[PDB]
Design a protein around this ligand. Structure first.
Ligand code: HEM
Ligand code: HEM
Ligand code: HEM
Ligand code: HEM
Lengths: 142, 145, 142, 145
């Protein structure tokens, strides 16, 4: 249910952003933790949860690279995220209600850093996309 | 309960919000990203595609009205539920708006504030605004019973 | 993401229930309308929204028969409901936040009428199933 | 605000609820149908499959505790938010429970009441119980801020 236009839009902003994978991922992760403090417990093993934290930098890059992988395989998001679905469900035990929270902070960060490119249609596309990534990450939960 | 830091994050950013621009942008996004919401706003005419929505004068005017109400919530931030009683009742009993759409709108507003303020919308400032949004949403959802 | 076991469970309760398609559908629809009164506006063209209403009986059967169609094509729910997705999105303009409400009242009715057969695992199966029907009905909304 | 009819639907059905049976059934369903919720209840031991959940004595005991608290909400039904303040804070700040799970639990409770009461759980009676559930959920979600 991503259209051709949606995929074009997602690939466009992603192409314009993916050079800052680490900064964007650190900001989205940091923001999730501060703005939605119910999520802190999952990262409670880190000494610092701020955006300046080295562990947040490292982990933000992983998030954003995994999302890039999905953009690059945008016709098989199910496939690209199935391993990560198992990990979140079975190892990490992340309540899947949290996936929309990180999806939201990623959009916030895209708007912050790329406000001209993050038009309402691009926003639509990206929201569809992260919804499909979230649906895929939830697939192994039950 | 607000911290002084939260109060400050809210009232300083608010003092620089253009309610016409931010309010129009936020409602545009609502109507484009969650297009089913277009059903609630038949009075606006043609709001069925992005370009039509973004240029629609009634959308712009309505977006300003919403952002003025956010201003009212801020002035009543110690008890938004009480202040929003009639408004909540209105959106429930007259308009029948499913309350998940208040969350959608709040998300669009946070996004617009990020786009508008850039690096000034720091993580702490966003956290305070998310709390404010949550309190508005809860106030609007309340007279659903 | 329905398992073999899930499909067995769904087909089982459905086989045990589908003889009361009309009563069950009238009860689920009636219950949605009374218990979640925000949904009444969509059926405001009916003179009577009670479970005894003839228009509710007629429409309940349609709902339940459409769900039976999905049970009978349980490996292609996307396909079975795509026409109905277009209808709900484009003609009827039903806010897709309501789909979970009817899903819930259908489960309530299954439990009411078939409490021995509606075990916790069957409930799981049926909840997965109605979630997939709801996801499918939402597919054409954007 | 409650109608007399609503009050009656709630207190008459409540007078026939076996809180051990209904509470165990409701929590079993929560843990089977929404199995991610198992993460919040590590203290119970093995709750990783349906048969283990359904026979687990700690699940049963906890389900009774929850249903007793529903009884407390009913006794305070004119202001459940105030009465549930500590409990809300507990589920937020100590347990970190995402509030969508309160909705999941409420759904399981309505289902269990349907299964338990059959045709006596008429549409009006269900509507009153859904309102009660919604008020409990809102009270439990409140101290999330
Ligand atoms: C868009 C959604 C998400 C994606 C793309 C994503 C991606 C990832 C990736 C790539 C890893 C690393 C796995 C490894 O190195 O082997 C991971 C780990 C993890 N994820 Fe996520 N994740 C998402 C959502 C979430 C959410 C919402 C939470 C919690 C609120 C969460 C909590 C974690 C935790 C706790 C780890 C382990 C981190 C560590 O120990 O340093 N994830 N995730
Ligand atoms: C933060 C969220 C919102 C606030 C603060 C807000 C505020 C307002 C205000 C102040 C009005 C005008 C009331 C009057 O006539 O005195 C209004 C009208 C309306 N609102 Fe909202 N609202 C919000 C969200 C939404 C959502 C999400 C929807 C639908 C998806 C909605 C649908 C409407 C409609 C249909 C009207 C009447 C519009 C007309 O003039 O034709 N509102 N709202
Ligand atoms: C499981 C979810 C649902 C299914 C399987 C379903 C199925 C159907 C079917 C089969 C029709 C008849 C179309 C025809 O005769 O051509 C229909 C019509 C309709 N649906 Fe749904 N529907 C669902 C959810 C909803 C929801 C949640 C609402 C509103 C709250 C809704 C409102 C309507 C309305 C208003 C009509 C037109 C009814 C009439 O005019 O008599 N539907 N639906
Ligand atoms: C109607 C909804 C609920 C009510 C009325 C309720 C009530 C309670 C009560 C009374 C306690 C005991 C508090 C004490 O020690 O004094 C409790 C504990 C707990 N609740 Fe809830 N609760 C609800 C929903 C949930 C949900 C949905 C979850 C997780 C998904 C949850 C997780 C817990 C946990 C983890 C504990 C501590 C258990 C332990 O003894 O190890 N609760 N709850």
């Amino acid at each position: 249910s991503l259209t051709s236009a949606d995929k074009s839009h997602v690939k466009s902003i992603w192409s314009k952003a993916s050079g800052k994978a680490e900064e964007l991922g650190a900001e989205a992760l940091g923001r999730m933790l501060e703005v939605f403090p119910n999520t802190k417990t999952y990262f409670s093993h880190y000494a610092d949860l701020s955006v300046s934290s080295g562990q947040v930098h490292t982990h933000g890059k992983k998030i954003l690279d995994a999302i890039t992988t999905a953009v690059n395989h945008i016709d098989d998001i199910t496939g690209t995220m199935t391993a990560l679905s198992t990990l979140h469900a079975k190892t990490l035990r992340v309540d899947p209600a949290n996936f929309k929270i990180l999806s939201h902070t990623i959009l916030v960060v895209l708007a912050l850093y790329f406000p001209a490119d993050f038009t309402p249609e691009v926003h639509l596309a990206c929201d569809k996309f992260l919804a499909s990534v979230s649906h895929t990450l939830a697939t192994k939960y039950r | 309960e607000w911290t002084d830091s939260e109060r400050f994050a809210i009232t300083t950013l608010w003092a620089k919000v253009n309610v016409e621009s931010v309010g129009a942008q936020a409602l545009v996004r609502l109507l484009v990203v969650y297009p089913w919401t277009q059903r609630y706003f038949g009075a606006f005419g043609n709001i069925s595609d992005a370009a039509a929505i973004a240029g629609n004068a009634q959308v712009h005017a309505h977006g300003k009205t919403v952002l003025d109400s956010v201003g009212n919530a801020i002035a009543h931030m110690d008890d938004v539920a009480d202040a929003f009683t009639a408004l909540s009742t209105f959106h429930s009993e007259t308009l029948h708006v499913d309350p998940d759409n208040f969350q959608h709108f709040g998300d669009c507003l946070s996004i617009v504030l990020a786009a508008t303020f850039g690096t000034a919308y720091t993580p702490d400032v966003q956290a305070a605004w998310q709390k404010m949004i949550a309190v508005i949403i809860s106030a609007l959802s309340k007279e659903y019973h």
